Design a protein around this nucleic acid. Structure first.
Lengths: 255, 54, 121, 385, 241
RNA sequence: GAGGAAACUCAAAGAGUGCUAU
RNA sequence: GAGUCCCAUAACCUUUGUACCCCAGAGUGAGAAA
RNA sequence: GCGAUGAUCACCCGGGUGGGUACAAAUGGCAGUCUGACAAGU
């Protein structure tokens, strides 16, 4: 079925990482380029997309007097740029200069728009190719796991121990050879469930989450007539949450 | 870090005793105890001196 | 106001070329712009002579930026064609520089013109 | 005998009144000098009576020019008139600059200006405490206004202009090639993505930019019509015959059909690639125009892009002009910009690039007349060797 | 020696904001306000720190007299983090950029120069360094740019004129704090070539003393320059006794 | 004797700094 | 029980392939052509 | 009908070896995919 091919996940995630790098690069460029005209904006507004949107709304510091930045910026931020505008050290620019830099701001926002479109597309794919994991571990983590193995079957063949430390190979193999201590979390650390845990409970839930992840995956990968519902993931998610609740409930300190 | 990576350990040991490294050089006399704050960094060449010092 | 500035008068040009023409005999003279550019960065130059009639004059206006950044006196003179005759080379010279040597036989002559040059600037 | 003090702040003019006059005989005694440092004692000496902020950035510069030249501005005239009482005798006003004194006296015959050390000490005290003396009055922050105003006052007399500015060249270069890698990287991804659906077509149209447009039209291979064949035939030319091949290969291919959501990403992603090529061609033209304006001699002598790259290596057009001929040669010796007889032209041409940079860099509005003949000189040498 | 792909151990210097990069050789090094480029082609260090790539710039004594002054072993350098500095004689960013490096983002550098041709470059450098304000103006008349200057905790002068001492007095009087720093570089040949350098060096010192500057230190800039010293003083209005 | 850990703990002092201390 | 957190989506080395290179550098400084 | 606005300047038997810069590929190497019955309460 066209809706159950994992080669698309591995391409999308690779593309998603590439977009972040390139979108970041251009962000500094509009910062420095318009930084010529108005260097102070970068310190005030750090967000690249917000930085670009300001440029589209107002082009020149003179426009800051009348232009309204409420939708882009809160009240205290928008007033600060206005004060910076009239007291700016930057030099004036031509409209031909203005047009090109404005196109960059248009370029920035469009890729910010596409990046979310790719993110939504990736989520839809996983919920069709591996619904249970998206329920248990999540979308961003699951695609990266599948991409690491290169195939759903390959990761479905990875035992839970390896899934747990899938992304810590260097510290793993280094530590194993030097008779020093080994990883615990691997790629799964950026999952939600590990997040809510605290202290050493991080390691515990990582082991427990990895075990259930394999259970969900082997159902997702190999099930001949899997319903696209994630039920096995949901029930597995319930168990680990129960495991977390009792684990975090324990208090080492005497009361 | 307290790990004190061995490559950094020897490296600091090659500049404490730097006098013996080449017989023609003969630096000043300095004890050079290890400091408690330092970093390892790479000099970088500029485009004009591609030939001379790269 | 003019780009070629300051420009030595008929008199001050006179002692300059006399230093230049002799300095050539003593192998103390580097002749032409790229040698002028050469000496400034190495900081071996007393002061630099430039022709004000150079075609185009801007071909050598980079040298004063180098010269005064290194705090080296410089000056302009009317006719390139005369400088080559002083310099001893069979072609016009638009820029020339006197190299540093406290052991030169002409330290007093060079310093004499140098002092006048500083006052002119 | 000082009753009023004039102080100028980047936000505006400030006038103060001297409640108490410090001892002049012991003016240099340590205790009185310590008072100028001490706010508590200093506040007893003077008080702020009037402050007139400048309306905008422009007004500060003109007054900054006027004060530099010891001239009384309209703004300065108004504030003094409002505050200084009419005067048999003359009201005494403290001013930091003596040159300003005669100008004030001309406008106001009834005021006598003082600029002795006693005034200087008070001026020193006022400038020391700064905003603390303004007692909550809106003076902005003095440090930033100095930065902006001082920035403005600088370029004014040196006559710096955006025309001399050559950074736009440097940034666009790194932007032009940055675009080039990304369009190639993204376009290749389009080929792999659409390659699964219809792998043969990726072979048919090797030109990536053409391929993205054709994928945009041919979203699904199954849709094959004679009118569509004409439409894709209009795309590029039928001389290659690809228009017939795509219809034939589309009919018989092993490509697995992809989901509609997949297809939407392919064309939208292909749309992103098209925009960057659209901007890249726009920016490239802008580089050509800017270079002709900034460095006409280099542009004519070697070419807009090549001259642009040289400026980037030197870091600035000014940097390139300063360098000697030999340094300019090795500046472009890593990417063969300037490239035994072959080397001789390279050494020869490198000098002409160097002199041309000098002509463009220091001319307020360079022309291309010299670049034309200088290039012609190179052509004569090229034929000779 | 100090060749690109090689690595060096960068460590703090006694004067805050200055560093030593050790290795087969050592280098005086200051951290870069503006990573990714060199103002005059100087050498630069790059370190990975948690990871951000912080950069440093090498300081050439033979190009900057202040750097040579540190290396001669100057006891007190008022230029330090978070301090306002008035640099007289801002020919270019050869030394100013390094001074801007020492003060840091909190501090500022008030750069003063007269000629227009170097100022254009100073303007260009000064822009990339937000803490630098280029005051292209004559230092002999501080009243012209009093509008643009507040208090400065240290005044450094590389101005090469016969009449330096008077210039230092005016600028110190208008803008320098009490007990503030003063650092003067003196070239004997420029002032009085008739008499030996060492006589000029004493003569200028007395000019500082009558200008209410208690001079603290003087160091000859051997071997980096001939016939030069950095004189360091404190501006004590109250009394030099 | 030399030390270590914890703090909205309890004290004894030193230095500097801030805020109309009018 | 057990260092995710130094990109195994990677770094480095080896082999193969493609395209170019075998000048001085802080470059030299009056010859060249006949 | 020149020129200081700048002249001049590794190896072996026409042929093969030595070395250098940049990019691509390798299902080539490093390189070997953590452990396994106990834990928590009264």
């Amino acid at each position: 079925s066209a809706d159950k091919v994992d080669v698309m996940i591995i391409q999308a995630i690779a593309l998603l990482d590439d977009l972040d790098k390139e979108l970041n690069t251009y962000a500094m460029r509009c910062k420095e380029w318009y930084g010529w005209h108005f260097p102070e904006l970068a310190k005030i507004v750090t967000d690249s997309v917000a930085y670009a949107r300001i440029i589209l709304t107002m082009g020149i510091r003179s426009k800051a007097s009348e232009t309204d930045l409420s939708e882009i910026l809160p009240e205290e931020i928008e007033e600060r740029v206005k004060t910076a505008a009239e007291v700016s050290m930057g030099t004036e620019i031509t409209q031909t200069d203005l047009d090109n830099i404005n196109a960059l701001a248009e370029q920035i926002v469009e890729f910010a728009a596409y990046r979310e479109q790719l993110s939504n597309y990736l989520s839809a794919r996983m919920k069709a190719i591996a619904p249970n994991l998206t329920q248990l571990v999540g979308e961003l983590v699951g695609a990266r796991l599948i991409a690491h193995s290169g195939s759903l079957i390959s990761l479905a063949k990875s035992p839970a121990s390896t899934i747990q430390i899938l992304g810590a190979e260097k510290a793993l193999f280094r530590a194993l050879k030097t008779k020093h201590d080994t990883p615990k979390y691997g790629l799964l650390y950026h999952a939600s469930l590990v997040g809510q845990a605290t202290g050493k409970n991080k390691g515990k839930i990582a082991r427990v989450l990895a075990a259930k992840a394999a259970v969900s995956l082997r159902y997702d990968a190999l099930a001949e007539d899997r319903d696209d519902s994630g039920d096995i993931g949901l029930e597995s998610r319930a168990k680990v949450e129960n495991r977390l609740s009792q684990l975090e409930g324990r208090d080492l300190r005497t009361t | 870090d307290d790990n004190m990576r061995r490559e950094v350990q020897r490296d600091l040991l090659l500049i404490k005793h730097r006098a013996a490294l080449d017989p023609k050089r003969h630096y000043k006399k300095q004890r050079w105890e290890v400091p408690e704050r330092f970093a390892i960094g790479t000099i970088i060449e500029d485009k004009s001196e591609f030939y001379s010092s790269r | 106001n003019p780009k070629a500035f300051p420009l030595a008068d008929a008199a001050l040009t006179q002692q300059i070329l006399d230093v230049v023409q002799q300095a050539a005999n003593l192998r103390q003279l580097k002749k032409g712009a790229n040698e002028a550019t050469k000496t400034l960065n190495r900081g071996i130059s007393e002061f630099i002579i430039m022709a004000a009639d150079c075609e185009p004059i801007e071909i050598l206006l980079h040298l004063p930026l180098l010269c005064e950044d290194k705090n080296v006196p410089y000056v302009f003179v009317p006719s390139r064609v005369a400088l080559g005759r002083a310099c001893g080379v069979s072609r016009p010279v638009i820029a020339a520089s006197i190299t540093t040597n406290d052991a030169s036989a002409i330290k007093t002559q060079i310093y004499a013109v140098k002092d006048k040059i500083e006052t002119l600037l | 005998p000082i009753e009023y003090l004039l102080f100028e702040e980047p936000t505006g003019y400030a006038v103060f009144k001297v409640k108490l006059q410090q001892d002049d005989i012991g003016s240099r005694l340590k205790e009185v000098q310590e008072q100028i440092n001490d706010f508590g004692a200093f506040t007893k000496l003077i008080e702020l009576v009037s402050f007139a902020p400048f309306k905008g950035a422009a007004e500060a510069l003109e007054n900054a020019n006027d004060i530099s030249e010891g001239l009384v501005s309209e703004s300065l005239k108004a504030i003094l008139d409002l505050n200084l009482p009419k005067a048999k005798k003359n009201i005494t006003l403290a001013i930091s600059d003596k040159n300003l004194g005669p100008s004030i006296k001309e406008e106001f015959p009834y005021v006598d200006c003082i600029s002795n050390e006693l005034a200087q000490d008070l001026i020193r005290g006022v400038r020391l405490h700064g905003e603390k003396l303004f007692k909550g009055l809106q003076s902005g922050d003095l440090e930033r206004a100095q930065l902006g105003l001082g920035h403005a006052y600088s370029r004014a007399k040196v006559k710096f202009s955006v025309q001399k500015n050559d950074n736009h060249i440097i940034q666009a270069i790194a932007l032009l090639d940055q675009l080039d890698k990304d369009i190639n990287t993204f376009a290749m991804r389009v080929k792999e993505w659409y390659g699964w659906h219809f792998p043969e077509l990726a072979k048919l149209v090797p030109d990536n930019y053409t391929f993205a447009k054709l994928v945009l039209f041919i979203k699904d291979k199954a849709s094959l019509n004679d009118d569509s064949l004409h439409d894709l035939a209009a795309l590029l030319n039928e001389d290659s015959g690809i228009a017939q091949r795509v219809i034939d290969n589309a009919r018989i291919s092993m490509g697995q059909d992809i989901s509609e959501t997949d297809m939407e990403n392919v064309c939208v992603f292909a749309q992103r690639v098209a925009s960057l090529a659209d901007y890249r061609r726009q920016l490239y033209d802008y580089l050509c125009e800017k270079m002709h304006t900034v460095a006409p001699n280099l542009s004519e002598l070697i070419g807009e892009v090549i001259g642009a790259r040289l400026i980037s290596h030197a870091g600035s057009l000014t940097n390139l002009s300063k360098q000697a001929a030999s340094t300019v040669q090795i500046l472009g010796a890593e990417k063969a910009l300037f490239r035994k007889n072959k080397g001789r032209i390279s050494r020869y041409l490198a000098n002409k690039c160097s002199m041309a940079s000098r002509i463009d860099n220091y001319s307020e509005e360079p022309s291309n007349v010299f670049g034309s003949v200088l290039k012609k000189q190179v052509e004569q040498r090229l034929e000779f060797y | 020696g100090a060749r690109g792909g090689a690595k060096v151990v960068i460590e703090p210097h006694r004067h805050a904001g200055v560093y030593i990069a050790r290795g087969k050789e050592d280098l005086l090094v200051t951290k870069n306000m503006a990573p990714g480029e060199s103002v005059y082609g100087e050498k630069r260090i790059s370190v990975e720190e948690p990871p951000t790539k912080v950069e440093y710039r090498v300081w050439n004594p033979f190009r900057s007299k202040l750097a040579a002054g540190i290396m001669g072993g100057l006891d007190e350098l008022f230029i330090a983090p978070g301090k306002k500095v008035l640099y007289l004689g801002a020919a270019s960013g050869t030394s100013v950029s390094h001074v801007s490096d020492v003060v840091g983002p909190e501090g500022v550098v008030y750069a003063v120069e007269f000629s227009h041709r170097p100022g254009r470059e100073l303007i260009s450098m000064a822009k990339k360094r937000p803490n630098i304000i280029p005051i292209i103006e004559d230092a002999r008349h501080p009243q012209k740019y009093r509008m643009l200057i507040g208090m400065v905790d240290c005044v450094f002068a590389d101005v090469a004129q016969p009449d330096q001492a008077r210039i230092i007095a005016l600028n110190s009087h208008m803008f320098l704090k009490d007990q503030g720093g003063v650092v003067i570089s003196i070239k004997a040949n420029c002032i009085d070539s008739t008499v030996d350098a060492e006589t000029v060096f004493a003569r200028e010192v007395q000019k500082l003393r009558e200008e209410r500057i208690k001079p603290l230190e003087q160091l000859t800039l051997e071997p980096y320059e001939r016939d030069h010293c950095i004189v360091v003083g404190r501006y004590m209005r109250s009394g030099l006794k």
